[PDB]
Write a protein that binds this ligand. Structure first.
Ligand SMILES: [Mn+2]
Ligand SMILES: [Mn+2]
Ligand SMILES: [Mn+2]
Ligand SMILES: [Mn+2]
Ligand SMILES: [Mn+2]
Ligand SMILES: [Mn+2]
Lengths: 201, 201, 201, 201, 201, 201
């Protein structure tokens, strides 16, 4: 897990020309003021008019510098009806989440030695779920209304590996012959899938 | 921070006669079923008719066995008007919180080398705060309505050191002469304070 | 990373009825003998006549009990011409590898905040590569001969999330409507992909 | 616990204008000389003519730069007859101590799930005690002579949260109405307590 | 460093037939009583009539079960005039020490990338030293009187690798031809050295 | 073990005038290019015409900057017939190794509480061994041909404490009277041993 802190506070210095280290260097405490332990960035719903039909509003260290060294972060996710937060992985954290409104099918997948088991449940307001570090998982809005959840992590920067976008729309894309061997389908099918992720999101 | 996991899942075996280790031993996976990554325990408001005027509903490993080894937990806190979650400390975790309804004065205190600075702000629906590991902090309901928040931790068992209850109502209590020297007041004042915490909460 | 050791040696007790804990309980040292720090299991090539055209021979704690508590493990991977070790993730470790024979295209993918960049290179005998914890990566045999590599991890049990098999052949499978929304293609395409992973490997 | 070291030595650069990071940046090894692994700062007794009747002489990274990255520090504490080191907490370390002279009542308090139990014993020359990370604890000189102890920590910067000074004399102070609700006493009692800690120590 | 604790207390169960895990299983709290956080084992001087002319009195988890999970331990070392605590290594901890009486030459050796530098100083009563994790170090009594020190570690079980005893008196001994090649001297010299450590201490 | 990473990549900035921190500061990602996750430095055999009769080719962070923050490194070791990699220790890592060609006697030594037990085995092509963190170990070429192995570590900078060179050829050397007491032999024997390591390797 994230390295433990070595003092009370260490607000991230996010200037483009700051020295680079594991994590972030910190502002002098003299320059921090009173408000660094607080945020209002998750107060508003994100724009769900995206190809996925969901929107992620992040509150990692890049958006909340006061989290630097403290071992935590939070995101909000909003969903249109029938929208998905697609199969994804956090390389550097466990996630713990609560549904705030609506009805979400939440799925969590075991690794190979767990027989790739899929656990899935419809989760409603006030109900919670846990995603062990590094495992593939997804959410799907099964209600007729807009849904939203707020999720927390045991890292200041968990990372997000979106599985469809990474497989089919990386920069540059994975070669077609690699994908035909891996996916057990013809080139035409692979090229169709790539055409859907060419725009970069 | 909590030790990292060494497999996908390890649901806590909470039987009274189970072998005792750092954390908890685990149920055989054969005995776990489909639902261990989920809970509904935070769906309902706690009973705020307490001396503090607040109620803590816990979702640590004792209440959510599926969190075992995963490095996370969550609590809900509900507040009557004018109620407080009194000055307290988590010995083993950072906290990250969001206010769900109402208006809460949230205060966080630096240690001695931070000049014991008090940072405090009124936090409203959808707004967030962070409490660095081991620092004293409190919340106070400044609104006219019932308030509530949901908070997450980077530990399966953060611990709670309630400062007033521990100072004045430990089992057995701290000797009066220790408290008169520490608090710089006469025995009568110390005995008055003890009389308020004699009931154990 | 894996918890540090608290003594010199702690050979895993792998009996089916042993108590379950994070990792594994240990054999009494009296029962260990002289050979637990050694193995010959990677001396022989695996059987590459599989749908992927590669074979993974594991030397994690389940196969090498002497690694328990020590923070390391190793695997061997053998490749038929044109074979792939498909896009996969290790939830709990960084990997460091060396190619022993043949020519392998090795690809490593950044996360979202790294713009999902793909780094790829043909790696030959004696040449090395590194895969940061939790990132998607693959290998593809571009030579005319059988290839092989040996890779090490900073975990006794890194875990393997095979991306194609998990997306299309989990137990039970991810619902088709979830995959049509996530993959941006019609049901027929999703069902074709599922038909290729129905056998469980 | 503190992050592990990534090289043999890394003496803290304590200049006021040095770049700020988790912990401290290090002096070039060229500038370190022979003496950084040694100190004489705990050779002399501190001045016990304080309101508490004790004095803490610190040997954390700010006073012993050679401890940087190494995961340890030490303090000395001297006591006048009837003096106290008042109820306090270390947010980032376990403490292990030895009494060198005199007779000290040493008390350690469990958290809420430990029923807030108080363990206390008179500890004499050569006898030892342990304080688990983040728990409230105190010492009180019950002898007729000056007492002293030397204590070590598993952090280069454990932090000190002095409970009375933080509750009643933070900068600025906790509002009186918060303290009347938390302490279950009238405003006059709270104001009396504040008047004793107004001077800042 | 040692894994962090997951609860307040976890006293080691040292029975010979207890289940074996990384570290130690714990006694039920019901069986612990009031005294587990305290010891008197370092109150008395060890017997310095040994071949080394020093004696180590240990207070690791085997001797102080209350240290289990807490990340700390302590030893006392007593020295006859001209006695040595010979070149040794702690595989799993940093050490921080204080001299209590007498005059000790204390030496600390850098690794290969530190040019194998030797730092050494005569350390007297109340003066302190630090030994970074895993580095070779020694002490030698240069005074005319008995000397002693008390040292603390950031592990419950640091381990001790005594260099002369391990090189020349392991069980069974390192083969003579291995030592002649490593030490660049003839068999007769190696056999002389072995004859001095044949007794097992 | 090494601190976990807080982002995908952080290539070490090895310039002599770069700011110094635990580990290394990082190059801006803009300056990294495509090749930092790869190396060819272990492709060639080292020069075994040394006093030890072996050669270590290192691929730690100083030689492979892309390993910075990732928790891993690798070395190659080549052996002349009858050559040794002498008794040594890694202060900051476990090692996991594979023999690539030839026949090597590999020995691993327990600490004092393990009765200083020596485990040793002849290890041949494709066979593996593990060295727990901080324990003394060695290899000796018992074949008639040149041998080689490749070894991996759970640290970017494990450190190497060569026991003979450190005991007899440190900078400056350990005083002769310290070594006569520790080794239980006369000054002449100690001076003979020092004369063999005076050249610095
Ligand atoms: Mn997620
Ligand atoms: Mn709290
Ligand atoms: Mn891999
Ligand atoms: Mn203390
Ligand atoms: Mn030592
Ligand atoms: Mn080695």
């Amino acid at each position: 897990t994230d390295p433990d802190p070595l003092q009370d506070f260490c607000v991230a210095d996010l200037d483009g020309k700051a020295v680079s280290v594991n994590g972030h260097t910190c502002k002098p405490m003299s320059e921090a003021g009173d408000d660094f332990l607080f945020s209002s960035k998750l107060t508003k719903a994100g724009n769900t008019s995206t190809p996925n039909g969901s929107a992620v509003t992040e509150l990692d260290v890049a958006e909340w510098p006061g989290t630097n060294t403290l071992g935590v972060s939070m995101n909000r996710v909003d969903f249109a009806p029938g929208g998905t937060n697609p199969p994804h992985i956090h390389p550097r954290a466990t996630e713990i989440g609560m549904v705030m409104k609506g009805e979400l099918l939440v799925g969590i997948l075991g690794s190979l030695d767990s027989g790739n088991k899929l656990y899935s449940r419809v989760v409603r307001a006030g109900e919670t779920f846990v995603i062990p570090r590094g495992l593939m998982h997804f959410q799907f809005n099964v209600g007729k209304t807009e849904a939203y959840m707020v999720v927390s992590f045991n890292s200041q920067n968990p990372g997000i590996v979106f599985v469809p976008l990474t497989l089919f729309g990386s920069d540059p894309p994975i070669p077609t012959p690699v994908l035909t061997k891996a996916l057990r389908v013809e080139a035409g099918v692979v090229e169709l899938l790539k055409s859907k992720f060419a725009g970069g999101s």
